[PDB]
From a paper:
To understand the structural basis of reduced GR sensitivity and identify other important substitutions, we purified AncGR1.1 expressed in E. coli and used X-ray crystallography to determine its atomic structure in complex with DOC at 1.95 Å resolution. AncGR1.1 adopts the classic steroid receptor active conformation, consisting of three helical layers, an internal ligand cavity bounded by helices 3, 5, 6, 7, and 10, well-defined ligand density within the cavity, and a surface for coactivator binding formed by helices H3, H5, and H12. The conformation of AncGR1.1 is very similar to the previously determined AncCR crystal structure, with a root mean square deviation (RMSD) in backbone atom position of only 0.66 Å, and most of the larger deviations are far from the ligand. The side chain identity of all residues within 4 Å of DOC are conserved except for A36G, which alters a ligand-contacting residue but has no discernible effect on hormone sensitivity. These results indicate that AncGR1.1′s reduced sensitivity to hormone must be due to indirect mechanisms not involving contacts with the ligand, such as changes to intraprotein contacts that affect the stability of the protein-hormone complex. In AncGR1.1, the smaller side chain of Ala43 loses its van der Waals contacts to Leu72, opening a small cavity in this region. The poor packing that results is expected to destabilize the receptor-ligand complex. In AncGR1.1, this hydrogen-bond network is much sparser, largely due to the replacement of Arg116 with His. The loss of favorable interactions presumably destabilizes these helices, the ligand pocket, and possibly the coactivator interface. It appears that Ser71 in Chain B of AncGR1.1 might stabilize the receptor through direct and water-mediated hydrogen bonds that a cysteine would not form.
Numbering used by the authors: -1 to 173, 180 to 247
Write the structure that this text describes.
Amino acid sequence: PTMISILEAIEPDVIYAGYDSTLPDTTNRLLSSLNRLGGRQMISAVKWAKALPGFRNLHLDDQMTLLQYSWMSLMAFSLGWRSYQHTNGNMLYFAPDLIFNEERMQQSSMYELCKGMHKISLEFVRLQVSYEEYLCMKVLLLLSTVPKDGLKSQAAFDEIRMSYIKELGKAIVKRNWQRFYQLTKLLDSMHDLVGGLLQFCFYTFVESKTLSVEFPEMLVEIISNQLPKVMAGMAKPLLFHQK
Ligand SMILES: C[C@]12CC[C@H]3[C@@H](CCC4=CC(=O)CC[C@@]43C)[C@@H]1CC[C@@H]2C(=O)CO
């Protein structure tokens, strides 16, 4: 089987938030639901990541570190893709039972960040990103935020990352350098957006009582590790372009 076949085969099914739409929206309900969904998606992401060629050969500590650093990037990018594929206009397709319009983006109290995530879908539109390109790009996001002090299997990581860069190149050819330049530019743009998402995430995590935002155990585990590392500057982006 081809590398791209495996990527297609291991791509998770769509996840539901478990939202009751008969009950009115509130800020707390929306954010807590977003978090419950985030937690479910991350359980699936762990499963997905563990099945990735090459990546599955890294020491397990490296596997969980990369997933932990890249969590927000992966989910924002997948959101962008879902919103492109299943929706049109200013709408975010978080889940089949949790779709945001202008109202819901406003009431979430993270309106500007919703618009930032929406920009990803607009870029998928403009560039006409193929499914195969998207699958390759998503893996690159898993491999694009690393601890500043390095990984256990650094040389192996570099090799794995290069192979998926080559995979992206194959996805491009199927259908050149200009497209590579453009798609890697889109990857780089995730870092600034994710910075904004993380600022708000940490705020809601800390202010959760006074606000009243619920987080699942899955996200509590991630955030309690990521809050200190990100705030302490331990995460380094691996950029394709000059900053
Ligand atoms: C973490 C977060 C709720 C969960 C989402 C995240 C943005 C990206 C994202 C995409 C999804 O498809 C599932 C939810 C999620 C992971 C939001 C950024 C701010 C927001 C909060 O801080 C709510 O407390």
